[PDB]
Design an enzyme around this catalytic site. Structure first.
Site, mmCIF file in Angstrom:
data_model
loop_
_atom_site.group_PDB
_atom_site.id
_atom_site.type_symbol
_atom_site.label_atom_id
_atom_site.label_comp_id
_atom_site.label_asym_id
_atom_site.label_seq_id
_atom_site.Cartn_x
_atom_site.Cartn_y
_atom_site.Cartn_z
ATOM 1 C CG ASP A 48 10.033 13.575 7.232
ATOM 2 O OD1 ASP A 48 11.208 13.943 7.014
ATOM 3 O OD2 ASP A 48 9.061 14.357 7.185
ATOM 4 C CB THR A 81 16.664 18.356 7.897
ATOM 5 O OG1 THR A 81 15.985 19.280 7.037
ATOM 6 C CG2 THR A 81 16.521 18.819 9.339
ATOM 7 C CB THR A 82 18.845 13.731 9.073
ATOM 8 O OG1 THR A 82 18.861 13.272 7.715
ATOM 9 C CG2 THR A 82 17.411 13.776 9.571
ATOM 10 C CG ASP A 386 9.048 19.938 -0.418
ATOM 11 O OD1 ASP A 386 9.346 20.890 0.333
ATOM 12 O OD2 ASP A 386 8.469 18.909 -0.013
#
Lengths: 518, 543, 480, 230
Positions: A48, A81-82, A386
């Site tokens: 994650d 996010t990354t 989510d």
């Protein structure tokens, strides 16, 4: 202490490059695992991206600024996010020889990134395809991408219905040129807050519009249902009060005990007369209510409900309209709780409940979650937020973009062609942005085992000839079409990926010196 | 380097002196200047301030950075006190003050190698500082170019360029500049202070944004309720009654229920509450007030007396609006009619003199227009546009753009900035340095050449070349000041500034960049106060 | 930078040498000379140290010639006595009977401070205060007898001399305070009237009505017995020393002394106890048993006058033979930085006037006497013989360091300005000196630069004594 | 590209060290695998001596800095709670699988194909797992066949001399507490007690319960037959 010259610009690039190079393997469904070594014997093996960034301790402040962006990006959308951090880190890496070796002033690069931000968002709008947000069967297939490959895969049929009814509950669709465009005002945090109820069934879980409370009727004989209920909200509890100044009560004579007993009945009755002034059908108190006020309000034809949290009263004002009032003596008659649908107290799960619901859409509600156990409710909880986050991005605009690197390459091809017609000093950093847009799908190629040199050059040639929807497959690893094989992503993720990464990259270039001091 | 451990002169602490302390003073002010070097001007960029805890902050303000900057040095802490002197007085321009004192110390250290005594360096600066203020006072000018040219328009145009309002700002700047120019008042004993908050801005949904109208007077947003009353009355002269007390039927309290079991109480409460509200209206129609403004509203029966008398009532007025109406219309806000033991409106005492009150029909919401009261000088702007969502961003930006305009006008004596003060004084002191001489000419030459560092470093943050712009900036003022003292000119035009937005040299008076006299005079004088205190230290004794 | 971390800066040689914390014992003598320079003349603490270093530098050449420091120190005695006698010949004699010369001398000392235009009323303040205490042939007059009182509020133009005396404290704000008294006798009480409070652990516990009256009767009688002994001595005004540890004057004692018609002023600062015992001509009282009338004063009127907000007490007409006109001056101002700089500016003005009282006459400052005396001692050196004759030449060259340094610190050319002084002082006498206003050599008498003769006399006297105490040290050893 | 108080391995060296560190634990647990294995002795340092051939029991006592062996110890945590035996066999399958893949990593093969190749072979192994297995009847007369099953577990942890002694004891311990039906078996009903000062070959089975404190008196009967418990 202080960093001057062009070396500080390199330190800002290496700070973002160090954070980016670590999470490069966290992109895609095939993303490789990462092993973090703590000073304790324990370790973290999960892949994650948001969980690893929070466990990494960094020194240079630009690396902390990239972590602050991941905290905000994770709250807006669930995934990607990354992707923002890698994109923002590669732009600084591609512009590194232009800023340092080419001796270009940073504001020239910063002003160029402002133009490249708008040019990149216009390409995404052209590549995206329309989608029907009103179709219930189509939205369940869009949410299913965030459902399957999870513990809820067995309930996926029930999860898509629960998530669709939850998104449609909080959203309010309004637009016009009169008062402006609210953009549907969808807020997952405050208004979608859920109440986990042990027992029942996952299919039995419903999304109700209103505020759900666990407190029952406080009197044994009272009306449990009101046709047209009127809610009144207040803060100060109903009970015997005391003087605001110093009060010393010393009772010796036997006939002095009845004086306080009479005042005890009067002080409670005066608080009830202020409530009954509007003749309400319901009484809801934030704090507790004494047994004396229970009988005084019983003769007035109203129900008494005590022990209600303050966070709930804020949501009750949306479904009712009662204005929050602190002191009961200040209670206005304008606080009537009219347009309240059902007061039904019917018990669910061996616990007495109460229904504040109605027939209207305040954009406030409490989802009723039921399942086989409390551990199942916790797995549904985080998976429902989510699932709604993916459905939220679909409802914010009827457009979908191809994933797997198709949208990343679609922007780089159009940016390189548009920058040739501008003919200015900003043309050189535009090619660096287009090269950074090609590294995201190339990262998926490196994780898929394919040749990053051969597959990237052939994929770019397919965009100049064929459509822009041809991405890279995670399971296979060869160039394939995203639309025909069922790989899609919403545009809102692509909108926040290009905007937040470039905006954060500009802020890192604005700092040429590090100031040391408190 | 780092002189220490002296074998002689036994003391309880180390002692340094000579060229070592004079070189440390230059290295100290150089690192401090480099912190504010990139933050100079609006083209500057923000920096990160890191503490020992590991947290940090990001701000572009040069005043907040120097306050939190950790500097251990006897001359370095003098610049910290210099930074606090500009923040407590002017509050802006601290970045430019540090750069001035930093360049003076670097050039004063070069005079040491020239065998120039530091007292002559100090005296050379003090004599030049007194005459520099005189030259600055000669180029000062009041607000001009309002007719035939446009100045304040370009001020609001550059301030709105960062917002959506900047598209139509060319039409919008005419409403803000013309209004504020006529709203100026002398306050007490000829102050002529422009108001910080005035000209209430409204909003409307009609047509496009270019239809916004400037009303020569105050305009309140409200309706007349019942339409049986005329919208235009008393053209020649009209009186407006400002009343905070309601004309509606008076109740007891919001928490008191009316329950009547006694028929005597029903007749007593009714006639009493109905008799007081009619007495309040009786003192109005007898006072000759054609316009009545009530904050809590007006009942239907009490309004019937205004229909026959052609008096215009308004229900549910805003209390914050009527307090400004009393100043513009000369009236007085009436808190209650219960003063002393009597009940009455004090006719003609609380009634202000006005010309005409007419209701102009507007799309969507309709307002009340008030023009030409006794003494007002004020005005109002009602913005008509696409939607309130844009106007709310335009109204907030209009007040922000009004803030930049009202500060420039508040000072009746201004000077063009953007390099005009530093470049014009540089050329003047070049030829003026001969008028003094006697070892002080070298100090004046270094003091004048030290002024070019402000426009130099300012153009560095704009990515433009500072060597070409600062050089050409001198050539434009040089040829302009040749025929200026002769009182005859052909092509000579002075006050050429530096515009970094478009990257060209233009007049800042027309560009909209102006600075008050208080800003430039106190920044130049205080910069030498900290510079002299540093040059006077020949020895540092530290335990 | 002090060891505590305080950062201070100034050009005053008296403040530099005090905070320099010199551990070198011989160099500590320069601090004591600067203390004696400020105690006697009041000005020139910087120049007296520089003159000492020149004699030490000239003594280094004498030691290289094989000369013993005893003759070096003994020759400086005759060199100092001759330099003062030559200075008296060129000095312009002035008298204290002329009030126009004293105001101009004090006005120039006040022009070096932020307060300038307001010195018009400040100049006669220092002049009239000294003329009353000067009398005639009084030699040294201690400026500690002149008390400068600093109070917040008012303005600079508001000043009252009050030659009799002025206190530092207000009057009783409790019930019964007279705040004014006529025909008063003022004593100084170091004691404090309070109920018994031993330094050990004590506690008051009243569990009964009889216990309450027992504590009240013992306290009220003990306070009254002290009040009765004060009335028997006919004491109208009492001054109680300030002690914050215990109670100074009990509230019950304030009610007792108010019934006896005795004015009470408590919380008197301990610094003024030594000052009030001198000027008022009274004696300190340790105990009430020794407290009598013979230690009191005589005062016609004692009142509390408040200009603005100060509420300050003044006393006039001491009327004592042993007590003489000790004057306490009140200084007022708005900001705290006003009364401070004004006090130090008037203090320097009192030092310049103190120089004229002890030694009459004045000279033209700016290095004028240092050049001419050096030229005369060079010519008078031919009248001597032997080792001493060479010392007169080195002593004259050592006197030129003061005017040379003044030209160096002012930015003027060192070697050029010094030669201009030797050129002009040949034809004229004391008519030319170094002045920073004209940036060159001009007339210091026309520029209103006046240095009293006692400053230059004490600077040379303390220099010969400082160099003597230095050269007489042939060794140092650890002694505990 | 570094942070203070941090160490990191880049490129493929981070994986090669993790495999090499796993090869070190393999060589340790390669010797004790099976009935022909070895009996390891560990020393905590406080004077405790434990001799155990089980894989997990050794890993819990040993302290390992290598993070790869930590996951191997965590991998055996679910083995004892489910399988209960064969933890050493699992470690030998993890280590050698990394050694055989190490040769292919040096050839330039991406680890995803190596990882996916193991998962595809794992699914095919489960299909062959059901084909190779032998279905055994549920009859309770299989104790004779259970004697050979008990030897498989016993011969591994001992020297084979105590197997013949523990074969009837362990086999009859499970069948006695287990009534004959589908149901299940509960091993908690079997208590394990110990006493020193005797030889290990004297180990016998106790059908009942063993009590700690005995009766102390010279006239108490030693052997009592058919007595009523109160």
């Amino acid at each position: 202490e202080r960093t001057t010259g062009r070396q500080a610009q390199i330190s800002n690039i290496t700070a973002a490059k160090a954070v980016a190079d670590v999470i490069r393997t966290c992109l895609g469904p095939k993303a490789m695992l990462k092993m973090l070594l703590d000073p304790m014997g324990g370790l973290v093996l999960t892949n994650d991206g948001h969980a690893i960034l929070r466990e990494i301790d960094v020194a240079h402040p630009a690396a902390k600024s990239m972590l602050e962006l991941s905290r905000t990006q994770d709250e807006e959308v669930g995934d990607g996010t990354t992707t923002v951090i890698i994109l923002a880190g590669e732009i600084l890496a591609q512009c590194a020889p232009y800023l340092i070796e080419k001796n270009i002033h940073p504001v020239i690069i910063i002003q160029a990134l402002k133009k490249a931000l708008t040019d990149a968002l216009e390409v995404i709008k052209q590549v995206s395809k329309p989608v029907d947000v009103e179709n219930d069967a189509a939205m369940k297939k869009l949410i299913q991408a965030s459902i399957g490959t999870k513990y809820v895969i067995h309930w996926s049929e029930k999860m898509c219905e629960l998530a669709l009814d939850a998104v449609k509950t909080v959203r309010k669709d309004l637009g016009q040129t009169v008062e402006g465009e609210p953009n549907f005002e969808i807020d997952i945090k405050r208004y979608v807050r859920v109440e986990k109820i042990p027992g029942g069934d996952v299919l039995d879980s419903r999304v109700l519009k209103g505020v759900l409370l666990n407190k029952d009727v406080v009197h044994p004989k009272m009306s449990r249902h009101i046709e047209n209920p009127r809610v009144v909200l207040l803060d100060c509890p109903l009970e015997y009060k005391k003087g605001e100044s110093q009060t010393n009560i010393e009772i010796e004579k036997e006939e002095d005990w009845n004086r306080i007993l009479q005042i005890e009945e009067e002080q409670v009755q005066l608080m009830c007369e202020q409530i009954l002034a509007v003749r309400p059908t319901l009484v809801i108190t934030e704090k507790g209510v004494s047994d004396l006020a229970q009988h005084y309000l019983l003769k007035g034809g109203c129900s008494v409900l005590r022990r209600v949290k303050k966070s709930d009263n804020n949501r009750i004002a949306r479904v009712t309209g009662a204005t929050i009032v602190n002191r009961v003596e200040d209670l206005k008659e304008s606080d009537v709780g009219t347009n309240c649908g059902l007061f039904k107290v019917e018990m669910i799960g061996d616990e007495y409940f109460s229904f504040l619901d109605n027939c209207k859409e305040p954009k406030a509600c409490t989802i009723m979650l039921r399942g086989g156990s409390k551990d199942i409710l916790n797995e549904i909880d985080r998976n429902l937020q989510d699932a709604m986050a993916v459905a939220r991005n679909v409802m914010l605009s009827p457009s979908l973009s191809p994933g797997g690197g198709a949208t990343e390459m679609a922007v780089s091809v159009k940016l390189a062609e548009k920058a040739k017609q501008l003919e200015g000093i900003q043309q050189w950093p535009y090619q660096a942005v287009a090269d950074a847009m090609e590294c995201i799908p190339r990262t998926l190629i490196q994780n898929a085992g394919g040749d990053p040199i051969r597959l990237l050059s052939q994929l770019r040639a397919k965009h100049a000839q064929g459509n822009f929807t041809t991405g890279i497959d995670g399971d296979k690893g060869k160039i394939v079409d995203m639309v025909s094989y069922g790989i899609w992503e919403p545009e809102v993720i692509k909108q926040q990926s290009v905007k937040t990464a470039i905006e954060s990259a500009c802020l890192l270039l604005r700092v040429d010196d590090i100031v040391s001091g408190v | 380097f780092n002189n220490s451990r002296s074998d002689t002169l036994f003391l309880g602490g180390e002692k340094i002196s000579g060229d070592d302390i004079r070189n440390q003073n230059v290295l100290a002010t150089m690192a401090v200047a480099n912190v504010v070097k990139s933050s100079l001007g609006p083209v500057g960029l923000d920096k990160m301030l890191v503490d020992d805890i590991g947290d940090f902050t990001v701000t572009n303000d040069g005043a907040t950075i120097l306050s939190l900057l950790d500097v251990q040095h006897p001359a370095g802490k003098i610049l910290v006190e210099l930074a606090q002197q500009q923040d407590r007085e002017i509050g802006d321009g601290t970045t430019s003050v540090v750069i001035i004192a930093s360049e003076l110390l670097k050039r004063a250290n070069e005079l040491v190698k020239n065998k120039i005594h530091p007292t002559t360096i100090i005296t050379g600066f003090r004599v030049a500082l007194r005459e520099a203020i005189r030259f600055i006072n000669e180029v000062l000018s009041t607000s001009v170019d309002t007719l035939g040219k446009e100045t304040l328009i370009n001020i609001a145009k550059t301030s709105m360029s960062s917002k959506i309002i900047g598209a139509d700002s060319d039409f919008f700047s005419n409403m803000v500049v013309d209004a504020l120019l006529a709203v100026k008042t002398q306050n007490s004993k000829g102050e002529i202070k422009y108001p910080v908050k005035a000209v209430n801005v409204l909003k409307a949904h009609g047509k496009s944004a270019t239809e916004s109208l400037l009303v020569p007077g105050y305009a309140l947003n409200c309706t007349v309720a019942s339409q049986a009353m005329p919208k235009r009355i008393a053209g020649g002269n009209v009186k407006i009654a400002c009343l905070d007390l309601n004309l509606q039927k008076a109740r007891m309290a919001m928490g008191v229920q009316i329950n009547i079991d006694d028929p005597e109480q029903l007749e007593q409460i009714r006639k009493r509450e109905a008799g007081i509200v009619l007495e309040r209206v009786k003192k109005i129609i007898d006072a000759g007030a054609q316009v009545v403004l009530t904050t809590k509203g007006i009942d239907d029966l009490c309004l019937k007396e205004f229909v026959e008398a052609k008096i215009m009532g308004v229900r549910r007025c805003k209390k914050e609006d009527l307090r400004r109406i009393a100043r513009a219309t000369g009236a007085t806000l009436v808190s209650s009619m219960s003063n002393l033991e009597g009940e009455e409106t004090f006719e003609s005492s609380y009634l202000g003199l006005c010309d005409e009150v007419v209701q102009a029909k507007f799309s969507d919401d309709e307002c009340i227009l008030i023009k030409g009261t006794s003494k007002h000088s004020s005005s109002s702007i009602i913005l008509r546009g696409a939607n309130d969502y844009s106007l709310d961003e335009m109204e907030r930006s209009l007040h922000d753009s009004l803030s930049v305009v009202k500060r420039t006008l508040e000072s009746g004596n201004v000077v063009p900035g953007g390099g005009c003060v530093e470049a014009a004084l540089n050329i003047y002191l070049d030829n003026f340095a001969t008028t003094v001489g006697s070892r002080e000419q070298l100090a004046i030459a270094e003091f004048a050449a030290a002024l070019l560092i402000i426009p130099k470093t300012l153009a560095v943050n704009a990515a433009k070349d500072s060597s070409e712009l600062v050089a050409k900036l001198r050539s434009y003022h040089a040829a302009s000041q040749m025929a200026k003292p002769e009182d005859v000119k052909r092509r000579s035009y002075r006050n050429y500034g530096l515009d970094l937005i478009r990257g060209k040299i233009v007049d800042e008076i027309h560009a909209g960049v102006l600075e008050p006299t208080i800003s430039k005079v106190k920044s130049l004088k205080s910069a030498l106060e900290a510079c002299v205190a540093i040059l006077r230290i020949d020895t540092m004794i530290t335990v | 930078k002090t060891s505590r971390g305080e950062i201070i800066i100034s050009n005053d040689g008296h403040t530099i040498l005090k905070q320099m914390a010199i551990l070198h014992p011989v160099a500590r003598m320069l601090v004591e000379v600067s203390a004696a320079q400020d105690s006697e003349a009041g000005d020139g603490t910087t120049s007296v140290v520089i003159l000492t270093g020149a004699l030490l530098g000239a003594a280094e050449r004498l030691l290289n010639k094989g000369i013993h420091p005893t003759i070096i120190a003994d020759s400086f005695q005759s060199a100092a006595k001759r330099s003062v006698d030559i200075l008296l010949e060129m000095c312009h004699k002035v008298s204290l009977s002329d009030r126009e010369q004293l105001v101009r001398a004090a006005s120039t000392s006040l022009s070096s401070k932020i307060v300038s235009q307001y010195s018009s009323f400040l100049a006669p303040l220092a002049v009239d205060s000294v003329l009353k205490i000067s009398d005639e042939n009084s030699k040294n007059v201690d400026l500690n007898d002149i008390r400068l009182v600093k109070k917040v509020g008012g303005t600079i133009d508001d000043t009252e001399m009050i030659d009799g005396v002025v206190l530092t404290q207000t009057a009783i704000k409790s019930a019964g305070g007279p705040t004014r008294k006529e025909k008063a006798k003022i004593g100084l009480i170091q004691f404090q009237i309070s109920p018994p409070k031993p330094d050990t652990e004590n506690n008051i516990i009243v569990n009964d009505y009889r216990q309450m009256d027992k504590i009240l009767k013992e306290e009220r009688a003990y306070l009254l017995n002290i009040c009765k002994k004060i009335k028997k001595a006919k004491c109208n005004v009492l001054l109680i020393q300030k002690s914050i540890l215990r109670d100074a004057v009990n509230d019950l004692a304030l009610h007792f002394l108010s019934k006896l018609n005795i004015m009470v002023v408590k919380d008197i600062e301990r610094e003024e106890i030594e000052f009030l015992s001198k000027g008022l001509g009274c004696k300190p009282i340790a105990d009430i048993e020794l407290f009598t009338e013979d230690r009191l004063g005589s005062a016609d009127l004692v009142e509390e006058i408040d200009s603005d907000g100060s509420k300050i007490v003044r006393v006039t007409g001491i009327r004592n033979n042993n007590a003489r006109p000790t004057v306490s001056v009140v200084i007022r101002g708005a900001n705290n930085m006003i009364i401070d700089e004004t006090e130090r500016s008037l203090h320097d003005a009192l030092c310049v006037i103190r120089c004229l009282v002890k030694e009459r006459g004045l000279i033209a400052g700016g290095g004028a006497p240092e050049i001419e005396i050096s030229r005369r001692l060079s010519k008078e050196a031919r009248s001597m013989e032997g080792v001493q004759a060479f010392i007169w030449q080195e002593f004259a060259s050592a006197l030129e360091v003061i005017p040379t340094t003044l030209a160096e610190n002012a930015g003027l050319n060192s070697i050029k300005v010094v030669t201009e002084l030797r050129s002009k002082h040949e034809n004229g006498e004391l008519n030319d000196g170094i002045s920073v206003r004209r940036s060159g050599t001009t007339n210091t008498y026309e520029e209103h630069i006046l240095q009293p003769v006692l400053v230059s006399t004490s600077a040379i006297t303390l220099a010969s004594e400082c160099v003597k105490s230095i050269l007489r040290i042939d060794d140092i050893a650890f002694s505990r | 590209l570094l942070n203070p108080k941090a160490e990191s391995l880049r490129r493929d060296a981070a994986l090669k060290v993790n495999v090499t560190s796993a090869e070190g634990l393999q060589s340790v647990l390669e010797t004790n695998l099976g009935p022909k294995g070895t009996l390891k002795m560990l020393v905590d340092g406080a004077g405790n001596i434990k001799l155990t051939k089980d894989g997990k029991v050794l890993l819990t006592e040993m302290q390992i800095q290598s993070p790869t062996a930590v996951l191997i110890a965590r991998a055996a945590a679910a083995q004892d709670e489910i399988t209960g035996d064969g933890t050493t066999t699992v470690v030998c399958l993890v280590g050698e699988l990394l050694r055989q893949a190490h040769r292919f990593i040096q050839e330039g093969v991406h680890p995803r194909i190596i990882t996916d190749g193991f998962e595809i072979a794992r699914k095919e192994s489960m299909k062959f797992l059901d084909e190779f297995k032998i279905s055994k009847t549920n009859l309770s007369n299989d104790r004779e066949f259970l004697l050979q099953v008990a030897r498989s577990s016993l011969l591994t942890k001992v020297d084979a001399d105590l197997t013949e002694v523990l074969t009837p004891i362990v086999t009859d311990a499970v069948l006695s507490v287990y009534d004959a039906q589908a149901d299940n078996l509960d091993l908690h009903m079997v208590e394990i007690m110990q006493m020193q000062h005797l030889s290990p070959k004297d180990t016998t089975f106790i059908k009942g319960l063993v009590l700690d404190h005995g009766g102390r008196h010279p006239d108490m009967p030693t052997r009592v037959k058919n007595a009523y418990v109160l």
